[PDB]
Design an enzyme around this catalytic site. Sequence first.
Site, PDB file in Angstrom:
ATOM      1  N   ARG A   1      -0.158   4.597   2.869  1.00 11.57           N
ATOM      2  CA  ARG A   1      -0.124   4.380   4.309  1.00 11.57           C
ATOM      3  C   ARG A   1       0.213   5.592   5.181  1.00 11.57           C
ATOM      4  O   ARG A   1       0.194   5.486   6.394  1.00 11.57           O
ATOM      5  CB  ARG A   1       0.788   3.213   4.620  1.00 11.57           C
ATOM      6  CG  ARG A   1       0.218   1.894   4.149  1.00 11.57           C
ATOM      7  CD  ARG A   1       1.177   0.758   4.410  1.00 11.57           C
ATOM      8  NE  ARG A   1       2.250   0.647   3.404  1.00 11.57           N
ATOM      9  CZ  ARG A   1       3.390  -0.024   3.593  1.00 11.57           C
ATOM     10  NH1 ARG A   1       3.636  -0.640   4.744  1.00 11.57           N
ATOM     11  NH2 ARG A   1       4.288  -0.112   2.616  1.00 11.57           N
TER      12      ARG A   1
ATOM     13  N   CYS B   1       0.824  -1.237   0.000  1.00 14.53           N
ATOM     14  CA  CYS B   1       0.000   0.000   0.000  1.00 14.53           C
ATOM     15  C   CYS B   1       0.846   1.271   0.000  1.00 14.53           C
ATOM     16  O   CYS B   1       1.535   1.533   0.948  1.00 14.53           O
ATOM     17  CB  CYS B   1      -1.014   0.048   1.173  1.00 14.53           C
ATOM     18  SG  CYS B   1      -2.150   1.460   1.096  1.00 14.53           S
TER      19      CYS B   1
ATOM     20  N   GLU C   1      -4.208   3.786 -11.002  1.00 18.65           N
ATOM     21  CA  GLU C   1      -4.974   2.551 -10.862  1.00 18.65           C
ATOM     22  C   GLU C   1      -6.055   2.502 -11.932  1.00 18.65           C
ATOM     23  O   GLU C   1      -6.227   1.468 -12.549  1.00 18.65           O
ATOM     24  CB  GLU C   1      -5.614   2.432  -9.483  1.00 18.65           C
ATOM     25  CG  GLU C   1      -4.621   2.357  -8.343  1.00 18.65           C
ATOM     26  CD  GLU C   1      -5.364   2.308  -7.037  1.00 18.65           C
ATOM     27  OE1 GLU C   1      -5.918   1.216  -6.766  1.00 18.65           O
ATOM     28  OE2 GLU C   1      -5.428   3.360  -6.341  1.00 18.65           O
TER      29      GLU C   1
ATOM     30  N   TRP D   1      -9.355   5.986  -1.163  1.00 18.99           N
ATOM     31  CA  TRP D   1      -9.598   6.674  -2.397  1.00 18.99           C
ATOM     32  C   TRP D   1      -8.536   6.226  -3.406  1.00 18.99           C
ATOM     33  O   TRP D   1      -7.513   5.695  -3.032  1.00 18.99           O
ATOM     34  CB  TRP D   1      -9.595   8.200  -2.207  1.00 18.99           C
ATOM     35  CG  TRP D   1      -8.399   8.765  -1.504  1.00 18.99           C
ATOM     36  CD1 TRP D   1      -7.205   9.061  -2.072  1.00 18.99           C
ATOM     37  CD2 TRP D   1      -8.294   9.158  -0.126  1.00 18.99           C
ATOM     38  NE1 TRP D   1      -6.343   9.588  -1.136  1.00 18.99           N
ATOM     39  CE2 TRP D   1      -6.986   9.663   0.065  1.00 18.99           C
ATOM     40  CE3 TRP D   1      -9.176   9.140   0.961  1.00 18.99           C
ATOM     41  CZ2 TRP D   1      -6.525  10.137   1.309  1.00 18.99           C
ATOM     42  CZ3 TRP D   1      -8.727   9.603   2.202  1.00 18.99           C
ATOM     43  CH2 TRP D   1      -7.411  10.096   2.362  1.00 18.99           C
TER      44      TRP D   1
HETATM   45  C1  HEM Z   1      -6.656   6.309   1.530  1.00 20.92           C
HETATM   46  C2  HEM Z   1      -6.134   6.151   0.309  1.00 20.92           C
HETATM   47  C3  HEM Z   1      -5.455   4.917  -0.191  1.00 20.92           C
HETATM   48  C4  HEM Z   1      -4.672   4.885  -1.297  1.00 20.92           C
HETATM   49  C5  HEM Z   1      -4.404   6.051  -2.197  1.00 20.92           C
HETATM   50  C6  HEM Z   1      -4.147   3.564  -1.440  1.00 20.92           C
HETATM   51  C7  HEM Z   1      -3.329   3.190  -2.511  1.00 20.92           C
HETATM   52  C8  HEM Z   1      -3.062   1.887  -2.806  1.00 20.92           C
HETATM   53  C9  HEM Z   1      -2.595   1.404  -4.053  1.00 20.92           C
HETATM   54  C10 HEM Z   1      -2.230   2.185  -5.286  1.00 20.92           C
HETATM   55  C11 HEM Z   1      -2.473   0.057  -3.941  1.00 20.92           C
HETATM   56  C12 HEM Z   1      -2.042  -0.875  -5.054  1.00 20.92           C
HETATM   57  C13 HEM Z   1      -3.404  -1.351  -5.596  1.00 20.92           C
HETATM   58  C14 HEM Z   1      -3.416  -2.121  -6.882  1.00 20.92           C
HETATM   59  O1  HEM Z   1      -2.514  -1.951  -7.700  1.00 20.92           O
HETATM   60  O2  HEM Z   1      -4.352  -2.927  -7.144  1.00 20.92           O
HETATM   61  C15 HEM Z   1      -2.939  -0.304  -2.656  1.00 20.92           C
HETATM   62  C16 HEM Z   1      -2.940  -1.586  -2.202  1.00 20.92           C
HETATM   63  C17 HEM Z   1      -3.422  -1.881  -0.942  1.00 20.92           C
HETATM   64  N1  HEM Z   1      -3.844  -1.015   0.018  1.00 20.92           N
HETATM   65 FE1  HEM Z   1      -4.129   0.851  -0.146  1.00 20.92          FE
HETATM   66  N2  HEM Z   1      -4.503   2.851  -0.394  1.00 20.92           N
HETATM   67  C18 HEM Z   1      -5.361   3.549   0.380  1.00 20.92           C
HETATM   68  C19 HEM Z   1      -6.040   3.130   1.550  1.00 20.92           C
HETATM   69  C20 HEM Z   1      -5.989   1.853   2.083  1.00 20.92           C
HETATM   70  C21 HEM Z   1      -6.757   1.391   3.172  1.00 20.92           C
HETATM   71  C22 HEM Z   1      -7.789   2.177   3.910  1.00 20.92           C
HETATM   72  C23 HEM Z   1      -6.421   0.073   3.358  1.00 20.92           C
HETATM   73  C24 HEM Z   1      -6.903  -0.888   4.372  1.00 20.92           C
HETATM   74  C25 HEM Z   1      -7.632  -0.531   5.407  1.00 20.92           C
HETATM   75  C26 HEM Z   1      -5.412  -0.235   2.396  1.00 20.92           C
HETATM   76  C27 HEM Z   1      -4.833  -1.463   2.244  1.00 20.92           C
HETATM   77  C28 HEM Z   1      -4.233  -1.814   1.038  1.00 20.92           C
HETATM   78  C29 HEM Z   1      -3.939  -3.228   0.770  1.00 20.92           C
HETATM   79  C30 HEM Z   1      -4.190  -4.396   1.698  1.00 20.92           C
HETATM   80  C31 HEM Z   1      -3.415  -3.279  -0.468  1.00 20.92           C
HETATM   81  C32 HEM Z   1      -2.953  -4.539  -1.221  1.00 20.92           C
HETATM   82  C33 HEM Z   1      -4.107  -5.171  -2.045  1.00 20.92           C
HETATM   83  C34 HEM Z   1      -3.679  -6.422  -2.787  1.00 20.92           C
HETATM   84  O3  HEM Z   1      -2.788  -7.175  -2.315  1.00 20.92           O
HETATM   85  O4  HEM Z   1      -4.201  -6.733  -3.881  1.00 20.92           O
HETATM   86  N3  HEM Z   1      -5.171   0.862   1.656  1.00 20.92           N
HETATM   87  N4  HEM Z   1      -3.205   0.836  -1.933  1.00 20.92           N
HETATM   88  C1  Q16 Z   2      -8.135   0.277  -0.339  1.00 18.98           C
HETATM   89  C2  Q16 Z   2      -7.618   0.506  -1.728  1.00 18.98           C
HETATM   90  C3  Q16 Z   2      -7.279   1.791  -2.148  1.00 18.98           C
HETATM   91  C4  Q16 Z   2      -6.841   1.971  -3.480  1.00 18.98           C
HETATM   92  N1  Q16 Z   2      -6.513   3.202  -3.967  1.00 18.98           N
HETATM   93  N2  Q16 Z   2      -6.715   0.918  -4.302  1.00 18.98           N
HETATM   94  C5  Q16 Z   2      -7.033  -0.338  -3.907  1.00 18.98           C
HETATM   95  C6  Q16 Z   2      -6.884  -1.407  -4.953  1.00 18.98           C
HETATM   96  O1  Q16 Z   2      -7.029  -2.703  -4.465  1.00 18.98           O
HETATM   97  C7  Q16 Z   2      -7.495  -3.605  -5.454  1.00 18.98           C
HETATM   98  C8  Q16 Z   2      -6.878  -4.904  -5.009  1.00 18.98           C
HETATM   99  C9  Q16 Z   2      -7.538  -6.150  -5.562  1.00 18.98           C
HETATM  100  C10 Q16 Z   2      -6.590  -6.699  -6.616  1.00 18.98           C
HETATM  101  O2  Q16 Z   2      -6.254  -8.026  -6.275  1.00 18.98           O
HETATM  102  C11 Q16 Z   2      -5.286  -8.661  -7.128  1.00 18.98           C
HETATM  103  C12 Q16 Z   2      -4.715  -9.737  -6.247  1.00 18.98           C
HETATM  104  C13 Q16 Z   2      -4.835 -11.061  -6.626  1.00 18.98           C
HETATM  105  C14 Q16 Z   2      -4.311 -12.043  -5.785  1.00 18.98           C
HETATM  106  C15 Q16 Z   2      -4.410 -13.502  -6.168  1.00 18.98           C
HETATM  107  C16 Q16 Z   2      -3.688 -11.670  -4.594  1.00 18.98           C
HETATM  108  C17 Q16 Z   2      -3.623 -10.321  -4.267  1.00 18.98           C
HETATM  109  N3  Q16 Z   2      -3.042  -9.939  -3.132  1.00 18.98           N
HETATM  110  N4  Q16 Z   2      -4.104  -9.374  -5.081  1.00 18.98           N
HETATM  111  C18 Q16 Z   2      -5.362  -5.826  -6.626  1.00 18.98           C
HETATM  112  N5  Q16 Z   2      -5.567  -4.878  -5.575  1.00 18.98           N
HETATM  113  C19 Q16 Z   2      -7.491  -0.574  -2.610  1.00 18.98           C
END
Ligand code: HEM
Ligand code: Q16
Lengths: 405, 403
Positions: B110, B107, B284, B279
């Site tokens: 953070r 993320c 993305e 947000w």
């Molecule tokens: C507030 C604004 C936030 C922004 C701008 C943000 C931004 C991002 C971005 C760009 C990613 C990569 C996502 C992707 O490529 O699919 C991401 C992943 C993630 N963020 Fe955030 N984030 C935010 C808030 C949060 C919050 C509130 C949580 C949890 C409470 C969180 C937990 C995560 C997690 C767990 C991932 C990994 C998802 C995965 O493995 O697919 N984020 N974040």
């Molecule tokens: C909270 C939040 C904020 C923000 N700006 N963007 C996001 C995007 O989260 C979307 C989440 C769901 C997809 O999942 C793909 C994926 C697949 C698998 C098998 C594992 C994994 N960790 N992630 C990639 N990121 C989430």
Amino acid sequence: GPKFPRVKNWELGSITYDTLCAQSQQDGPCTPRRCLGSLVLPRPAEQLLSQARDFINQYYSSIKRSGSQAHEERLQEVEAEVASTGTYHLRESELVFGAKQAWRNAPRCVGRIQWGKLQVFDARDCSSAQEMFTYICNHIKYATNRGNLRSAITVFPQRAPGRGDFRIWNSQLVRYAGYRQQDGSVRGDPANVEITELCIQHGWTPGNGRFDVLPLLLQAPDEAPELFVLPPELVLEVPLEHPTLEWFAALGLRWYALPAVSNMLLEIGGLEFSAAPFSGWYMSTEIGTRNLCDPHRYNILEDVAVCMDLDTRTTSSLWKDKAAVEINLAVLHSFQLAKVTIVDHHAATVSFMKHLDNEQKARGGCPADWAWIVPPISGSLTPVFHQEMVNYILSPAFRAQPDPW
Amino acid sequence: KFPRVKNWELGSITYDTLCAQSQQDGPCTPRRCLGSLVLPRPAEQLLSQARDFINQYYSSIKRSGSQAHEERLQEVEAEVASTGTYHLRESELVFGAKQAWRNAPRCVGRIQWGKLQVFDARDCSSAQEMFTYICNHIKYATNRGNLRSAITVFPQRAPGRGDFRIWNSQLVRYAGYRQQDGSVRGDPANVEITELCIQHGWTPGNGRFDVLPLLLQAPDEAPELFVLPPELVLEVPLEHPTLEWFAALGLRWYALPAVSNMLLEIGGLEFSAAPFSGWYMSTEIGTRNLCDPHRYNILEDVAVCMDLDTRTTSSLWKDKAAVEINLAVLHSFQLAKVTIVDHHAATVSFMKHLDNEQKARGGCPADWAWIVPPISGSLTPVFHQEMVNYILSPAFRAQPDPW
Ligand code: HEM
Ligand SMILES: Cc1cc(N)nc(COC[C@H]2C[C@H](OCc3cc(C)cc(N)n3)CN2)c1
Ligand code: HEM
Ligand SMILES: Cc1cc(N)nc(COC[C@H]2C[C@H](OCc3cc(C)cc(N)n3)CN2)c1
Ligand SMILES: C[C@H](O)[C@H](O)[C@H]1CNc2nc(N)[nH]c(=O)c2N1
Ligand SMILES: C[C@H](O)[C@H](O)[C@H]1CNc2nc(N)[nH]c(=O)c2N1
Ligand SMILES: [Zn+2]
């Protein structure tokens, strides 16, 4: 399924398993507790013999004579030589195979589709700094070939028990000077400040330009490095213009044709070639994105953005992204006009995917460093971004080595 | 050994000591790094994860060693010894959720980790009730475009029974309809969930941006289908600040990125349904969701609209079109007063986060491949920053799809 890492491509949904990694003899920097994959450089009698045996085994497999009498005899001959001398020596054809295999094994190189096409200059007879220079000039002439670039390496004598090393002090055969100013800023390339100042301490008379080509500092065993000015006609450069932005040429930007790394160690069968410069041709992003736009390199993004009349006071105009794209385009356009080989980041990454398929079939995998293989602009626009990679160290290898000073 | 962590733009060096607190192995070994893979392949252990988590909590409120701390440890011990499990107090849950976000290596957002609205939905006994909680989550988080980070936590996994689950990967997803002739209308990433909705009774649309219903599942029951009220789902039509034709492309995206298929682990307890939202960062949408070849894949269409030379990679038509598309997303969100952060602002904030975390905990786990944005990587500061990746708990995790 298989107990080898599973590797997936998320664009295509295709799966492979890397079995090649089973051949790694050398630990990288990761553990189950933490991954260090993004670090640039994380921190022998019978040991030589086992590396040598392995390499000789690789050689004989590559010519399909494994278990043959010629294979067993070479193995004996290597152990006898280590036995009586502490070291051994490669046959010519072994060196050639080992050099190519080192390139093929290099996880950070996107250009490996070309790996089998490498001219290997044997310079293991070299005995002076003056002769290194001649060998280096010949390499430059061959490799540059008036713009139609050819991959090459020139191998100088190996490390030897208690004798000093051959070294090229410069990180590349072509480098622009970096001159520290009284205000603390830098004129020229800041990556080269230290080598510039070493050249000056060693008698070089400095220029005052942004693109002063540096002289070489060449070190023969147990001697102070000697200084050699490359004749300018040997160093092909490309003035940078943009295909539609007419003012871009007025910036006076340029870059050299030939990317020739000169400070890395080629290791083959436990033998260490401390001087073995190698060259290919450039991927356009190396010049137009990193060398020209890194904040700690020429850092020209703002200047270009201002010429393009972009709003540089806010990030959300994407002024950086726009200027960077035009800079890359100018690199590609100018190299094309000048007929100097170059590859854009789309063609290069597409070719690397083909390389991955070839290697899957030939060796069961391909060591690759994702952070280095994915280009520094337009990442997810390239097919390699969507391709999982397994990174591991195979030998023969190119390695970093400490600076000789 | 504590890794030396260098920033290559500034020459500054730190040492990550936080990685010693990892009690969970990742996929790498000394023989090979697997850091680029997206998902690589008893009471006494619950008690140790529980004690550790309670210890994190009392320390967070400074009261580390107090009566309250020692008594709470015994409560947890007593409950596990008798029942094989335990329950979190709400304050503990609130702390744990924030900590899971904080610890999420992928993320880039953070810096915001401390501003998280936590809805306790552990008093939920039915899919209907999950739906009500989800609607309230969307309303709160969306806030008429002024988006606010939030998480709603449904009841934990229990050894006896099936999980509470949201089948959808996000709370807002556009349908992907497969055509007998291979192609997909809509979002190819949602073909499967689209088909699952149909099979469970949904009347499909046939547009490129049909918002899906939710399939919500209470334990050991068939999932149920719930249509979100269109008024709850805020969307942004995409236009470009100078290219008039761009609006004619008919593109849009939703405001609220709300992930709904990840498991939240706190103190050994597992929350199989705990949707969370913030947000969007513009890339993305602009880069991945619209320009990925296996997503809406619009790059070509845009390039033709810009009259670029598509015949050769070396015109950088792709790079040029991607840029305008990201610009359009930023422009459109701004016009509409819906929160968005561009990838330069975001990564700058993340660098600041790294520094806060260095001072506060001696490190920050981060996954460089995910942190570095998908366009203009080296143009952002995070490209030049080395990063150590490792698993801390509380954590968000992937989990098997429930079908
Ligand atoms: C507030 C604004 C936030 C922004 C701008 C943000 C931004 C991002 C971005 C760009 C990613 C990569 C996502 C992707 O490529 O699919 C991401 C992943 C993630 N963020 Fe955030 N984030 C935010 C808030 C949060 C919050 C509130 C949580 C949890 C409470 C969180 C937990 C995560 C997690 C767990 C991932 C990994 C998802 C995965 O493995 O697919 N984020 N974040
Ligand atoms: C909270 C939040 C904020 C923000 N700006 N963007 C996001 C995007 O989260 C979307 C989440 C769901 C997809 O999942 C793909 C994926 C697949 C698998 C098998 C594992 C994994 N960790 N992630 C990639 N990121 C989430
Ligand atoms: C033929 C065209 C070639 C292209 C387009 C190419 C492309 C690249 C690129 C883009 C990099 C990353 C460079 C950076 O960011 O600094 C690289 C790294 C490298 N390539 Fe190549 N390559 C080529 C030929 C070669 C040859 C001929 C060799 C050796 C015989 C080689 C060995 C390497 C090595 C060792 C690295 C890693 C350098 C380091 O760790 O700092 N490549 N290649
Ligand atoms: C042969 C070749 C072709 C091509 N197109 N490009 C190249 C560029 O390689 C240049 C090399 C020298 C710098 O090395 C930096 C560096 C520093 C450190 C500490 C370790 C390391 N491996 N690399 C960046 N990569 C080389
Ligand atoms: C910290 C990080 O590893 C470092 O900046 C890397 C990232 N990827 C790279 N990739 C390439 N090709 N070349 C580089 O110099 C770098 N730098
Ligand atoms: C194979 C590779 O790790 C995969 O494409 C990753 C790369 N980086 C990413 N980074 C982000 N932020 N989101 C992603 O989905 C991905 N995909
Ligand atoms: Zn690793």
